[PDB]
């Protein structure tokens, strides 16, 4: 029922501006404050600020004043976070969350959006190269086999990896992406399956990098050496 | 500004253990008989989830094992019986007066018996070799603890500055980790050597495990 959907994120050039949106639904929009919280990759949570939707009353974290602007559109049930003159430092996951104007049951940060990644970089949107990681490198057969896909040289984050259109989840390990000296991201998604299924099962990794509009469905079949 | 500091910053505990996390505010969060201190649980790749609010209140859909206590400047979160799903960063938060704030967080890790990794090596893809690059992947599957040494050897020469590691988050079921290392070389650099080995060192192993192959799309 109640959902907050962040939007307007993604890649942005340093010195540039971004307008993030928090589409709220399933409740009286003017009855809950909208909070903006950021999380730098691998760091803690940071309260940016909040907006009271009825009168547009806004509270800020002193560090974010004059560069970050929280606004609203009552009619569109959307709160906004204007971020101007962005620096590499600003690279983070930006969440929105509601907090009741009235003290009560689960009043505080009850619901959050999924967050949007904001990457403040001069580098360009590069789509990945999906290479298969075939099972049995040199020696064939056993008991349990591993196979996968290498999601290579893309920018910015994120990328989504699925197996057999969501049907295969057990034993799946989609490694956190790592940044190479080149400034391009790379990850591998792996899966352990019983070796007796290789002769029968067809394994496909579904790769999606929304930033570059790249969708790749690559097959992982066995090889000799 | 009301700011908070959590203790410890990190902990490792066993399934069934009572785990205690403390939060100290720089000023009292009390007002109208309410102690405006909340607790959030953040799982990897997920938005933080409300556990406890106003020091002792339970959010709906939060397990019994989680409970909270405190007043004024000192607050405590207790997981009565640590479950493997409880791996997360736990944050205290103040909702008394703006600027609102969170503590630095406490990473709760789950302590399990030692588990050795399962090692797998992958030669570079034929289609990658057409694009002029060679990435050799090593997989260390389902192990505990997180500490593992992975060394790349090319024709028995110890590699340096051309490999990248990534560690999975703790499994919510078996509490094991998993890692992938990627030795990346040029198609030219790849084409001058035969043997490509991945040597693995981990507590769970009596001595190092070595997974290897000899260059070619054989």
């Amino acid at each position: 029922e109640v959902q907050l959907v962040e939007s307007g994120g993604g890649l942005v050039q340093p010195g540039g501006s971004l307008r993030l949106s928090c589409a709220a639904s399933g409740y009286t929009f003017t009855n809950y404050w909208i909070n903006w919280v950021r999380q730098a990759p691998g760091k803690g949570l940071e309260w940016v600020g909040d907006i009271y939707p009825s009168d547009s009353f806004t509270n800020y974290n002193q560090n974010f004043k004059d560069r970050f602007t929280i606004s609203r559109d009552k009619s569109k049930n959307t709160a906004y976070l204007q971020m101007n003159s962005l620096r590499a430092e600003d690279t983070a996951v930006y969440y929105c969350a509601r907090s009741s104007i009235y003290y009560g049951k689960d009043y505080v940060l009850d619901y959050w959006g999924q967050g949007t990644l904001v990457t403040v970089s001069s580098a360009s949107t590069k789509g990945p190269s999906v290479f298969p990681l075939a099972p049995s490198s040199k020696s064939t057969s056993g008991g349990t086999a591993a196979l996968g896909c290498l999601v290579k040289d893309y920018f910015p984050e994120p990328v989504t990896v699925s197996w057999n259109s969501g049907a295969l989840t057990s034993g799946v390990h989609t490694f956190p992406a790592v940044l190479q000296s080149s400034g391009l991201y790379s990850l591998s998604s792996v899966v352990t399956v019983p070796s007796s299924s290789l002769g029968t099962q067809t394994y496909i990794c579904n790769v999606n990098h929304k930033p570059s509009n790249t969708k790749v469905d690559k097959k992982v079949e066995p090889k000799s050496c | 500004d009301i700011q908070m500091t959590q203790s410890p910053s990190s902990l490792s505990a066993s399934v069934g253990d009572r785990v205690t996390i403390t939060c100290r505010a720089s000023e009292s969060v009390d007002n109208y008989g309410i102690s405006f201190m909340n607790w959030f649980q953040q799982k990897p790749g997920k938005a933080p989830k409300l556990l406890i609010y106003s020091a002792s209140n339970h959010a709906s859909g939060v397990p019994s094992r989680f409970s909270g206590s405190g007043s004024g400047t000192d607050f405590t979160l207790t997981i009565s019986s640590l479950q493997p799903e409880d791996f997360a960063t736990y944050y205290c938060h103040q909702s008394k007066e703006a600027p609102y704030a969170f503590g630095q967080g406490t990473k709760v890790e789950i302590k399990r018996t030692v588990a050795a990794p399962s090692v797998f090596i992958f030669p570079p893809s034929d289609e990658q070799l057409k694009s002029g690059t060679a990435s050799v992947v090593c997989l260390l599957n389902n192990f505990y603890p997180r500490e593992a040494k992975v060394q790349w050897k090319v024709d028995n020469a110890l590699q340096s500055g051309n490999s990248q590691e990534s560690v999975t988050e703790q499994d919510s079921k078996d509490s094991t980790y998993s890692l992938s290392s990627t030795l990346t070389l040029s198609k030219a650099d790849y084409e001058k050597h035969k043997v490509y080995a991945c040597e693995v060192t981990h507590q769970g192993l009596s001595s190092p495990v070595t997974k290897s192959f000899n260059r070619g799309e054989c």
Binding site: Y52, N59, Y103 | K96, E97, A98
Partner: peptide
């Protein structure tokens, strides 16, 4: 029966 409309709690 407490409300926050100004970044603080008041009785209303």
């Amino acid at each position: 029966q407490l409300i926050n409309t100004n970044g603080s709690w008041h009785i209303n």
